[PDB]
């Protein structure tokens, strides 16, 4: 799928302002809020909820309602360094010790 990029530098330095990845959106009938993806460093591709980190490169799709970008980012993209700047390392932990905790319950 091609591997995250885990360095201090954006792989779409292009994408870097909160502005540009604003604009690649649209009018965007998603139910997940195109504002917050943005803030969580995302782009969309014009390939339905198909959205991009600027600076990861992560990858992420069919969004449902009860999906939060910055949760999601975290639990895919753990290693983003956007990710670690804009939130910290005590918010990515409660997150993963969350999805994992909930990967629990249900079965
Ligand atoms: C918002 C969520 C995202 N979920 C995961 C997802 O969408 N993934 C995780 C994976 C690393 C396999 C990946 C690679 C490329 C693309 Cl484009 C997406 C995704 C699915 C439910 N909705
Ligand atoms: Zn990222």
Known sequence: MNFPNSTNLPRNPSMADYEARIFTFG??????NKEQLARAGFYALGEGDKVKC???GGGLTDWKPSEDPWEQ???????????????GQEYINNIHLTHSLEECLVR
């Open 27 to 32: 009018t965007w009938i998603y139910s997940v």
């Open 73 to 87: 980012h975290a639990k895919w993209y753990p290693g983003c360094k956007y990710l670690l700047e804009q939130k």
């Open 54 to 56: 600027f600076h990861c």
